[PDB]
RNA sequence: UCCUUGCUAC
RNA sequence: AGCAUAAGCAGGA
């Protein structure tokens, strides 16, 4: 007898048997070794999609520049994806866009955008993902790379007094006008760098391999920018964020389920006696190699035509930084002999000199990228990689969906980052061929290439949008990630309540039927108990932590008031996912047990739930044996100074500490201020006031010298 | 020098304090004179007054001060007596009148400026407006004036006559949209314009003076004509052909352990003897290894003598009750020691003429065929095993009169099916064995340990533990998330081997076992393999495979009441069929319907297989089978779907099927789904 | 006498040579980017390194002088609780945590614990005193809203709260004085009749103020009435294919 | 030129 | 040998 698990779909829908088709209970595939060939494929595939050879020499950079707009060599293979934008066509689409809703549309959204830019502090740049530090040329979090940037500013020329967005951006442009920039290398020596090399280094974007992407066969290279591109990109993402929040054909901020009901219901009420509707799910292919920033420069020159003089030149800098970006090409490749015994390593630097030790695909991809290679980097000038403008291309999609040709056959739909749903209304099937080929015509001219392999359609609503397969009436939910239930891993107190918070937030947002909630609650309970080696008292587990509990169980009177981390049973349920375990169980604890656990005179905690099991595990051992020991000394110094600033201002972690003078002078003036206020209504003693005054003056003469 | 012009009539302390305030504000020069006039005039107000007063005088001078502290002392006085400001800061603090005092100085008429600040704050604070020309329009209450006013208009006449003698009138003005126009950036922005433009100025003016035309549609239709793209229907050209399963050598058994061919020795579980090395010892006395004699000539395989000496060495190692293999040639050959290339950096290379000619070359992955053994392990894996509970689950919480009973009922019923199957035995095998291997890989790098391969289950109520094999670690120095350390697995089986299925094994013989219903054979298997850090993290938590399964089942049940609006759950899990398992000789409308509850058994099986055989091929194949499921749902309701390019689609599906047995198996069952659905709907082939 | 200690600490930290180049060279706001210098990348596997942490014998850093006042070096059968390896902080085992929890001293602090967490005990007190009924098994579903989800009686909008704690806890560096103060300054008098003398630290005090004044308004799919009391009853009352509500009071 | 060692409880 | 899949691990200081 054979067996087939797909047969349940013979009398069901694709809204119930579709979570069965996700391999989300297994490990995601990771990358191995160097990531050079993927970056070569991306850049060389972009130049293959350039559709031109019109090169222009450069005076700033020592490499040639290929153009990407209005220079087309029309091949006969037009179904192949193109990367060439017609600017008069897309500006005609923008003029066609603003004539649909309002008159002062871009002026209103630009005034709200600049209204939010002027009240923004630059410490928001530290609340982000990883960035690229060009000082040591590695990947670091945002606060570390920002503080190394400000360290290079205050080390090179002068100090920093900005504390705003605009003065920091103007500080970066002033760094572009500088002839020599000095920073620190490693054991902290001080090195220098010129002017053109600082331009070559400020526009370097580091590529690596995308790890853990469910749904692809071949891997892909993700890119991370530096620090001097992040505030300008934040400005553009605020502008396009307000533009996408004002529109009615986008789904990035999110409701994504009411909009499709209003456009299916609203466009099914606009049919004639013989017309009908066909929807098409598509997928825009090669989305990161066909979005050129020059069309972003033209459109962002068109949006802010009447905004200001600050915003008009402030929203026209990040596309200019995207037209001349460098690309790190990984870390090279490896060669070996015939016996596979000794394997030398060739880095990204000496790849030109060791060119004749490569493969056929490595030399094919390498000779099509050779006249654009720098020593370490490459000069891509038309690409828009991952980790960049994502709310601005959706506006291009809404511009493709708002085309008007003048019958009464047209289209509408909904746009995402690279997933569209197109609704067509027409009368006959060759007219459907005409309208769909007109949609491929307008998207093909503007620079959006629909994939002919991953697109289909039906007459009623049976479409697909952001992995939610919508049937004719019902809605399936997103197949969520499984390991996100247990990723706290910090404490015996902030794991199970964090797990109930994750189960609660996945219950409110997604469907998450109650049997799955109780089952995932019990499995997270079991992984909690298996993690921290704590079992209930009536079990037969005899380890080094259940011997004390089993020995001392006679002292506890009420046995079901113990905590789960102390060998208690379960009292939380589906209707208790918002109350923590300790606060639910403090109505039943013994007073010796409750007064013994919750004692703040404990050797573990001293030096959002109740902190009574909160311990800190020990640190590592190889953090003080490599060459990066002194940096850990520097974070020790930073924690000391932050402890002093905590010792001066008693309420500083509540409000954001703005100010632009210094830290120590606010300390000294604050100790003098509270020394006078606590002097005249308080102290009164000459030796104390004279001794504190003597220590402030001696510390000030010590600090100034 | 404007400073020396000032110091002829400006005070000496106001240089340092007022210049310090200008250093607080920014980089300006006329604000030195502005804070000089305002602050010096406020010093003239507080010059000779307060003959007799309280401990603190009548006037308090805090306008010219370090700009952090007028608010704080304003809070010490306004918090002492009880007052409240009105979004404004005051010049001189008065306590005789219990109000504020704010002074403005202008060159224009004193009417308009009082309408400005009075238009701002009204009659809340006290406003006094002064003029160099001698105008005065201020608030209605007054004080002890015509003494301070005479000297302050005398001083404004003095400095005003100094400005008449020095001609500085436009420089004496009291109180954003500029970007720093740099040099290399304007040379960069004009370089990165589109090709029909010269500078950014011409592009900005043409974008500011743009109107559209009707040459748009001519370019659009001119893009329509040179296209050659037709859509492909399905009711007339139903070319949904079955997929290309490779007709090559059969795909082997690639799982790390043995599922269907396992054999376990049992003993009652001791609570004191619970560590894995103690379970290893108590099964060395329990399962008699003195009768575990092996011949040095295997049935088939690759390496015979090294596994014989390795099994003898680990057998005398377990015999001496310590788990540490002393270094011999067998372990130095099997678990990789010294088998790594010499990673030489590019600082010394010492090139030789035509000697050590080095290059690189990559190959890819080889292709295999349809596995025939997978159906018997599917039907074996969902069959009930008498050993009962395998999975270490947890306790059930108490319930209110809410919906919780329903949830509890579902969980209890589903757990009552899934604890007895053999998939629970394999999940317990992976959890205990790979968990013990995980703790051994943390605690002892650089040392080869011995980890048993075992389970724990309840036999007739008596809690017992099993023993399925002997695992050997490979001195895992887990630096990164990769590393792929070498595990040497000695397995226990009781069936005759197969060179098609057990292709990677090195099957020896073990002996005889009495099996009561007579005394059958016993085959010991050998296999070297590898693990990593990530598969240790994911395999040791396979209990989460229980999480989606019930969800799927519960959706069906909920949709039933979503069509009926009546509490039919207990009888609906009994009087409902579910189609599975068509036969082999015929397929067409010959399906086996089972109960809805037993279906969950089959479902946990495929979830467990998604834990094992996850590769790239299963990911891409799951995307493309979601596409074909959308096509089949488009067939089920007669919606007349259509496609634009089928050929490259089948080149991607037939691209992403190479060697995974689950991917080839689900491809075959997808083709058989196309046959059974082809018996009713017309969009497919045979 | 705290200003003498702060003078000894400020003079102690200005004694260092290369530490003087740190302060009086940055800004006040740079403290924020002085707070975060996490040189680790992401701590990408917390539960993995936590299970690797708990598998050892002494994973925990614990204080010496508090634990040696009452604790015992080894338990009654081979259970290790102490080390001598290393500031004077000594490694330990979680068997000393549960040994502290069962064989240690106790200090009565139930009033402070039952006064810091008044919102959560209010959640349990409102949860215990409700009544349920039968289910419905019907189709249900509606859009996403912005709903205040806490039964507070003050209803501030996250702007008078930070300013309020500046004008309650520490007014010496509080804020520029706004017009939002007046009636809330009478409320400042009422709060200064409460938070004057307590053993509660100012970070915990500023924590516990912000849970009785802040209606947490979120963007959640709601259906039926939009009462703020039944918003922890959002996920318990109904899902997508079922509904249970019979609340009388 | 050299091979230091962490003590495992579903 | 093996894990693995377009390139790495199978010690290093």
PDB file of C-alpha atoms in Angstrom, chain B residues 113-330:
ATOM      1  CA  UNK B 113       7.027  95.321  20.664  1.00  0.00           C
ATOM      2  CA  UNK B 114       4.644  95.346  23.628  1.00  0.00           C
ATOM      3  CA  UNK B 115       1.969  94.126  21.215  1.00  0.00           C
ATOM      4  CA  UNK B 116       4.365  91.328  20.222  1.00  0.00           C
ATOM      5  CA  UNK B 117       5.242  90.052  23.697  1.00  0.00           C
ATOM      6  CA  UNK B 118       1.801  90.986  25.051  1.00  0.00           C
ATOM      7  CA  UNK B 119       0.377  89.137  22.053  1.00  0.00           C
ATOM      8  CA  UNK B 120       2.458  86.155  23.204  1.00  0.00           C
ATOM      9  CA  UNK B 121       1.884  85.961  26.970  1.00  0.00           C
ATOM     10  CA  UNK B 122      -0.731  88.628  27.744  1.00  0.00           C
ATOM     11  CA  UNK B 123      -1.238  89.962  31.276  1.00  0.00           C
ATOM     12  CA  UNK B 124       0.420  86.950  32.923  1.00  0.00           C
ATOM     13  CA  UNK B 125       3.914  88.303  33.618  1.00  0.00           C
ATOM     14  CA  UNK B 126       5.154  91.898  33.918  1.00  0.00           C
ATOM     15  CA  UNK B 127       6.576  93.471  30.747  1.00  0.00           C
ATOM     16  CA  UNK B 128       8.541  96.729  30.500  1.00  0.00           C
ATOM     17  CA  UNK B 129       9.650  98.016  27.086  1.00  0.00           C
ATOM     18  CA  UNK B 130      12.476 100.544  26.676  1.00  0.00           C
ATOM     19  CA  UNK B 131      13.798 102.425  23.662  1.00  0.00           C
ATOM     20  CA  UNK B 132      17.087 104.121  22.768  1.00  0.00           C
ATOM     21  CA  UNK B 133      15.081 107.028  21.312  1.00  0.00           C
ATOM     22  CA  UNK B 134      13.224 107.600  24.590  1.00  0.00           C
ATOM     23  CA  UNK B 135       9.893 105.825  24.130  1.00  0.00           C
ATOM     24  CA  UNK B 136       8.185 103.913  26.938  1.00  0.00           C
ATOM     25  CA  UNK B 137       4.948 101.912  26.641  1.00  0.00           C
ATOM     26  CA  UNK B 138       4.698  99.200  29.289  1.00  0.00           C
ATOM     27  CA  UNK B 139       2.357  97.440  31.696  1.00  0.00           C
ATOM     28  CA  UNK B 140      -0.135  99.300  33.918  1.00  0.00           C
ATOM     29  CA  UNK B 141       1.330  98.567  37.421  1.00  0.00           C
ATOM     30  CA  UNK B 142       4.414 100.524  38.441  1.00  0.00           C
ATOM     31  CA  UNK B 143       6.916 100.783  41.281  1.00  0.00           C
ATOM     32  CA  UNK B 144       9.518 103.174  42.714  1.00  0.00           C
ATOM     33  CA  UNK B 145      10.480 104.646  39.319  1.00  0.00           C
ATOM     34  CA  UNK B 146      11.704 108.123  38.191  1.00  0.00           C
ATOM     35  CA  UNK B 147      15.055 107.292  39.816  1.00  0.00           C
ATOM     36  CA  UNK B 148      16.129 104.172  37.932  1.00  0.00           C
ATOM     37  CA  UNK B 149      14.333 105.380  34.781  1.00  0.00           C
ATOM     38  CA  UNK B 150      16.301 108.645  34.738  1.00  0.00           C
ATOM     39  CA  UNK B 151      19.622 106.807  34.917  1.00  0.00           C
ATOM     40  CA  UNK B 152      18.608 104.098  32.446  1.00  0.00           C
ATOM     41  CA  UNK B 153      17.451 106.629  29.823  1.00  0.00           C
ATOM     42  CA  UNK B 154      20.620 108.563  30.651  1.00  0.00           C
ATOM     43  CA  UNK B 155      22.569 105.381  29.870  1.00  0.00           C
ATOM     44  CA  UNK B 156      20.592 104.724  26.680  1.00  0.00           C
ATOM     45  CA  UNK B 157      21.303 108.329  25.698  1.00  0.00           C
ATOM     46  CA  UNK B 158      24.982 107.719  26.515  1.00  0.00           C
ATOM     47  CA  UNK B 159      25.458 104.523  24.493  1.00  0.00           C
ATOM     48  CA  UNK B 160      23.052 105.885  21.862  1.00  0.00           C
ATOM     49  CA  UNK B 161      25.269 108.957  21.461  1.00  0.00           C
ATOM     50  CA  UNK B 162      28.272 106.613  21.298  1.00  0.00           C
ATOM     51  CA  UNK B 163      26.566 104.811  18.412  1.00  0.00           C
ATOM     52  CA  UNK B 164      25.886 108.215  16.857  1.00  0.00           C
ATOM     53  CA  UNK B 165      29.609 108.984  17.203  1.00  0.00           C
ATOM     54  CA  UNK B 166      30.644 105.573  15.814  1.00  0.00           C
ATOM     55  CA  UNK B 167      27.882 104.902  13.194  1.00  0.00           C
ATOM     56  CA  UNK B 168      26.763 101.422  14.302  1.00  0.00           C
ATOM     57  CA  UNK B 169      22.985 101.147  13.837  1.00  0.00           C
ATOM     58  CA  UNK B 170      22.406  98.127  11.575  1.00  0.00           C
ATOM     59  CA  UNK B 171      24.921  96.104  13.633  1.00  0.00           C
ATOM     60  CA  UNK B 172      22.781  96.529  16.793  1.00  0.00           C
ATOM     61  CA  UNK B 173      20.013  94.096  15.791  1.00  0.00           C
ATOM     62  CA  UNK B 174      18.555  91.694  18.363  1.00  0.00           C
ATOM     63  CA  UNK B 175      17.782  88.120  17.160  1.00  0.00           C
ATOM     64  CA  UNK B 176      18.422  77.506   9.970  1.00  0.00           C
ATOM     65  CA  UNK B 177      17.715  76.832   6.292  1.00  0.00           C
ATOM     66  CA  UNK B 178      21.388  76.694   5.228  1.00  0.00           C
ATOM     67  CA  UNK B 179      23.092  73.441   4.282  1.00  0.00           C
ATOM     68  CA  UNK B 180      26.897  73.411   4.321  1.00  0.00           C
ATOM     69  CA  UNK B 181      27.702  73.866   0.621  1.00  0.00           C
ATOM     70  CA  UNK B 182      30.972  71.950   0.373  1.00  0.00           C
ATOM     71  CA  UNK B 183      33.308  71.677  -2.628  1.00  0.00           C
ATOM     72  CA  UNK B 184      33.856  67.984  -3.409  1.00  0.00           C
ATOM     73  CA  UNK B 185      30.166  67.142  -2.980  1.00  0.00           C
ATOM     74  CA  UNK B 186      29.028  69.722  -5.531  1.00  0.00           C
ATOM     75  CA  UNK B 187      31.707  68.357  -7.882  1.00  0.00           C
ATOM     76  CA  UNK B 188      30.296  64.876  -7.157  1.00  0.00           C
ATOM     77  CA  UNK B 189      26.573  65.631  -7.555  1.00  0.00           C
ATOM     78  CA  UNK B 190      27.065  67.238 -10.978  1.00  0.00           C
ATOM     79  CA  UNK B 191      29.075  64.164 -12.023  1.00  0.00           C
ATOM     80  CA  UNK B 192      26.270  61.717 -11.133  1.00  0.00           C
ATOM     81  CA  UNK B 193      23.406  63.300 -13.081  1.00  0.00           C
ATOM     82  CA  UNK B 194      21.682  61.459 -15.967  1.00  0.00           C
ATOM     83  CA  UNK B 195      23.262  61.720 -19.397  1.00  0.00           C
ATOM     84  CA  UNK B 196      20.985  64.373 -21.065  1.00  0.00           C
ATOM     85  CA  UNK B 197      21.906  66.829 -18.267  1.00  0.00           C
ATOM     86  CA  UNK B 198      25.035  68.856 -17.508  1.00  0.00           C
ATOM     87  CA  UNK B 199      24.646  70.057 -13.908  1.00  0.00           C
ATOM     88  CA  UNK B 200      22.184  69.543 -11.076  1.00  0.00           C
ATOM     89  CA  UNK B 201      20.841  73.082 -11.605  1.00  0.00           C
ATOM     90  CA  UNK B 202      19.462  72.348 -15.088  1.00  0.00           C
ATOM     91  CA  UNK B 203      17.953  69.061 -13.889  1.00  0.00           C
ATOM     92  CA  UNK B 204      16.361  70.883 -10.956  1.00  0.00           C
ATOM     93  CA  UNK B 205      14.900  73.603 -13.192  1.00  0.00           C
ATOM     94  CA  UNK B 206      13.578  71.087 -15.726  1.00  0.00           C
ATOM     95  CA  UNK B 207      12.039  68.986 -12.955  1.00  0.00           C
ATOM     96  CA  UNK B 208      10.525  72.202 -11.560  1.00  0.00           C
ATOM     97  CA  UNK B 209       9.128  73.139 -14.994  1.00  0.00           C
ATOM     98  CA  UNK B 210       7.779  69.758 -16.143  1.00  0.00           C
ATOM     99  CA  UNK B 211       4.464  69.102 -17.893  1.00  0.00           C
ATOM    100  CA  UNK B 212       3.530  65.750 -19.409  1.00  0.00           C
ATOM    101  CA  UNK B 213       2.494  65.110 -23.015  1.00  0.00           C
ATOM    102  CA  UNK B 214       0.871  62.409 -25.181  1.00  0.00           C
ATOM    103  CA  UNK B 215       4.121  60.999 -26.546  1.00  0.00           C
ATOM    104  CA  UNK B 216       3.905  58.717 -23.491  1.00  0.00           C
ATOM    105  CA  UNK B 217       1.368  56.408 -25.151  1.00  0.00           C
ATOM    106  CA  UNK B 218       3.382  56.294 -28.387  1.00  0.00           C
ATOM    107  CA  UNK B 219       6.430  55.011 -26.498  1.00  0.00           C
ATOM    108  CA  UNK B 220       4.129  52.669 -24.563  1.00  0.00           C
ATOM    109  CA  UNK B 221       2.582  51.063 -27.666  1.00  0.00           C
ATOM    110  CA  UNK B 222       6.058  51.129 -29.242  1.00  0.00           C
ATOM    111  CA  UNK B 223       7.023  48.965 -26.256  1.00  0.00           C
ATOM    112  CA  UNK B 224       3.924  46.782 -26.779  1.00  0.00           C
ATOM    113  CA  UNK B 225       4.732  45.963 -30.414  1.00  0.00           C
ATOM    114  CA  UNK B 226       8.270  44.601 -29.924  1.00  0.00           C
ATOM    115  CA  UNK B 227       7.306  42.131 -27.182  1.00  0.00           C
ATOM    116  CA  UNK B 228       6.251  38.689 -28.582  1.00  0.00           C
ATOM    117  CA  UNK B 229       4.637  37.426 -25.380  1.00  0.00           C
ATOM    118  CA  UNK B 230       1.476  35.308 -25.275  1.00  0.00           C
ATOM    119  CA  UNK B 231      -0.362  33.910 -22.264  1.00  0.00           C
ATOM    120  CA  UNK B 232      -0.885  30.162 -21.874  1.00  0.00           C
ATOM    121  CA  UNK B 233      -4.349  28.943 -20.891  1.00  0.00           C
ATOM    122  CA  UNK B 234      -5.134  25.591 -19.269  1.00  0.00           C
ATOM    123  CA  UNK B 235      -8.496  24.434 -20.656  1.00  0.00           C
ATOM    124  CA  UNK B 236      -7.034  24.117 -24.178  1.00  0.00           C
ATOM    125  CA  UNK B 237      -3.298  23.424 -23.656  1.00  0.00           C
ATOM    126  CA  UNK B 238      -3.184  21.557 -20.323  1.00  0.00           C
ATOM    127  CA  UNK B 239       0.546  20.799 -20.462  1.00  0.00           C
ATOM    128  CA  UNK B 240       0.957  20.249 -16.696  1.00  0.00           C
ATOM    129  CA  UNK B 241       3.183  17.231 -17.265  1.00  0.00           C
ATOM    130  CA  UNK B 242       4.544  15.102 -14.405  1.00  0.00           C
ATOM    131  CA  UNK B 243       7.936  16.052 -13.030  1.00  0.00           C
ATOM    132  CA  UNK B 244      11.237  14.466 -14.046  1.00  0.00           C
ATOM    133  CA  UNK B 245      12.298  12.109 -11.268  1.00  0.00           C
ATOM    134  CA  UNK B 246      15.899  11.058 -12.049  1.00  0.00           C
ATOM    135  CA  UNK B 247      16.305   7.526 -13.409  1.00  0.00           C
ATOM    136  CA  UNK B 248      19.673   6.767 -11.812  1.00  0.00           C
ATOM    137  CA  UNK B 249      21.102   4.929  -8.794  1.00  0.00           C
ATOM    138  CA  UNK B 250      18.776   4.773  -5.787  1.00  0.00           C
ATOM    139  CA  UNK B 251      19.197   7.342  -3.013  1.00  0.00           C
ATOM    140  CA  UNK B 252      20.705   5.740   0.116  1.00  0.00           C
ATOM    141  CA  UNK B 253      19.663   5.905   3.755  1.00  0.00           C
ATOM    142  CA  UNK B 254      21.210   9.141   5.016  1.00  0.00           C
ATOM    143  CA  UNK B 255      19.792   9.595   8.531  1.00  0.00           C
ATOM    144  CA  UNK B 256      22.348   9.598  11.340  1.00  0.00           C
ATOM    145  CA  UNK B 257      20.617   6.841  13.339  1.00  0.00           C
ATOM    146  CA  UNK B 258      18.548   3.765  12.508  1.00  0.00           C
ATOM    147  CA  UNK B 259      14.773   4.136  12.644  1.00  0.00           C
ATOM    148  CA  UNK B 260      13.109   0.955  11.383  1.00  0.00           C
ATOM    149  CA  UNK B 261      16.011  -1.472  11.891  1.00  0.00           C
ATOM    150  CA  UNK B 262      16.655  -0.733  15.568  1.00  0.00           C
ATOM    151  CA  UNK B 263      17.076  -3.221  18.417  1.00  0.00           C
ATOM    152  CA  UNK B 264      17.140  -2.271  22.102  1.00  0.00           C
ATOM    153  CA  UNK B 265      18.167  -3.962  25.338  1.00  0.00           C
ATOM    154  CA  UNK B 266      16.068  -3.189  28.409  1.00  0.00           C
ATOM    155  CA  UNK B 267      16.558  -2.889  32.163  1.00  0.00           C
ATOM    156  CA  UNK B 268      14.633  -1.157  34.974  1.00  0.00           C
ATOM    157  CA  UNK B 269      15.666   2.456  35.490  1.00  0.00           C
ATOM    158  CA  UNK B 270      17.623   3.377  38.618  1.00  0.00           C
ATOM    159  CA  UNK B 271      17.095   6.917  39.898  1.00  0.00           C
ATOM    160  CA  UNK B 272      20.509   7.142  41.577  1.00  0.00           C
ATOM    161  CA  UNK B 273      22.280   5.798  38.464  1.00  0.00           C
ATOM    162  CA  UNK B 274      21.041   8.378  35.964  1.00  0.00           C
ATOM    163  CA  UNK B 275      24.100   9.947  34.306  1.00  0.00           C
ATOM    164  CA  UNK B 276      24.728   8.675  30.737  1.00  0.00           C
ATOM    165  CA  UNK B 277      28.074   7.045  31.541  1.00  0.00           C
ATOM    166  CA  UNK B 278      26.374   5.217  34.423  1.00  0.00           C
ATOM    167  CA  UNK B 279      23.634   4.064  32.033  1.00  0.00           C
ATOM    168  CA  UNK B 280      26.491   2.919  29.774  1.00  0.00           C
ATOM    169  CA  UNK B 281      28.034   0.922  32.631  1.00  0.00           C
ATOM    170  CA  UNK B 282      24.763  -0.606  33.854  1.00  0.00           C
ATOM    171  CA  UNK B 283      24.079  -1.682  30.283  1.00  0.00           C
ATOM    172  CA  UNK B 284      27.594  -3.120  30.105  1.00  0.00           C
ATOM    173  CA  UNK B 285      26.596  -5.454  32.916  1.00  0.00           C
ATOM    174  CA  UNK B 286      22.990  -5.653  31.663  1.00  0.00           C
ATOM    175  CA  UNK B 287      23.603  -6.208  27.931  1.00  0.00           C
ATOM    176  CA  UNK B 288      26.413  -8.775  28.006  1.00  0.00           C
ATOM    177  CA  UNK B 289      29.245  -7.590  25.753  1.00  0.00           C
ATOM    178  CA  UNK B 290      31.263 -10.724  26.502  1.00  0.00           C
ATOM    179  CA  UNK B 291      29.080 -12.463  23.911  1.00  0.00           C
ATOM    180  CA  UNK B 292      29.629  -9.532  21.516  1.00  0.00           C
ATOM    181  CA  UNK B 293      32.319 -11.219  19.439  1.00  0.00           C
ATOM    182  CA  UNK B 294      32.877  -9.904  15.918  1.00  0.00           C
ATOM    183  CA  UNK B 295      34.781 -11.439  13.043  1.00  0.00           C
ATOM    184  CA  UNK B 296      37.407  -9.196  11.388  1.00  0.00           C
ATOM    185  CA  UNK B 297      35.909  -9.965   7.952  1.00  0.00           C
ATOM    186  CA  UNK B 298      32.665  -8.004   7.421  1.00  0.00           C
ATOM    187  CA  UNK B 299      29.746  -8.930   5.198  1.00  0.00           C
ATOM    188  CA  UNK B 300      30.278  -5.802   3.107  1.00  0.00           C
ATOM    189  CA  UNK B 301      31.587  -2.288   3.597  1.00  0.00           C
ATOM    190  CA  UNK B 302      34.890  -0.442   3.242  1.00  0.00           C
ATOM    191  CA  UNK B 303      37.163  -0.763   6.308  1.00  0.00           C
ATOM    192  CA  UNK B 304      37.087  -3.925   8.405  1.00  0.00           C
ATOM    193  CA  UNK B 305      40.109  -4.086  10.708  1.00  0.00           C
ATOM    194  CA  UNK B 306      39.880  -0.506  12.003  1.00  0.00           C
ATOM    195  CA  UNK B 307      36.279  -0.993  13.138  1.00  0.00           C
ATOM    196  CA  UNK B 308      37.201  -4.328  14.746  1.00  0.00           C
ATOM    197  CA  UNK B 309      40.095  -2.846  16.726  1.00  0.00           C
ATOM    198  CA  UNK B 310      38.012   0.250  17.493  1.00  0.00           C
ATOM    199  CA  UNK B 311      35.102  -1.845  18.785  1.00  0.00           C
ATOM    200  CA  UNK B 312      37.444  -4.011  20.844  1.00  0.00           C
ATOM    201  CA  UNK B 313      39.196  -0.926  22.220  1.00  0.00           C
ATOM    202  CA  UNK B 314      35.928   0.744  23.195  1.00  0.00           C
ATOM    203  CA  UNK B 315      34.610  -2.553  24.591  1.00  0.00           C
ATOM    204  CA  UNK B 316      37.580  -2.932  26.923  1.00  0.00           C
ATOM    205  CA  UNK B 317      37.231   0.814  27.562  1.00  0.00           C
ATOM    206  CA  UNK B 318      33.645   0.393  28.792  1.00  0.00           C
ATOM    207  CA  UNK B 319      34.826  -2.761  30.608  1.00  0.00           C
ATOM    208  CA  UNK B 320      37.218  -0.732  32.798  1.00  0.00           C
ATOM    209  CA  UNK B 321      34.410   1.760  33.688  1.00  0.00           C
ATOM    210  CA  UNK B 322      35.983   4.897  32.234  1.00  0.00           C
ATOM    211  CA  UNK B 323      34.996   6.700  29.032  1.00  0.00           C
ATOM    212  CA  UNK B 324      38.222   7.946  27.446  1.00  0.00           C
ATOM    213  CA  UNK B 325      39.840   6.283  24.435  1.00  0.00           C
ATOM    214  CA  UNK B 326      43.616   6.057  24.783  1.00  0.00           C
ATOM    215  CA  UNK B 327      45.423   7.169  21.582  1.00  0.00           C
ATOM    216  CA  UNK B 328      45.913   4.321  19.106  1.00  0.00           C
ATOM    217  CA  UNK B 329      46.039   4.137  15.314  1.00  0.00           C
ATOM    218  CA  UNK B 330      42.349   3.216  14.955  1.00  0.00           C
TER     219      UNK B 330
END
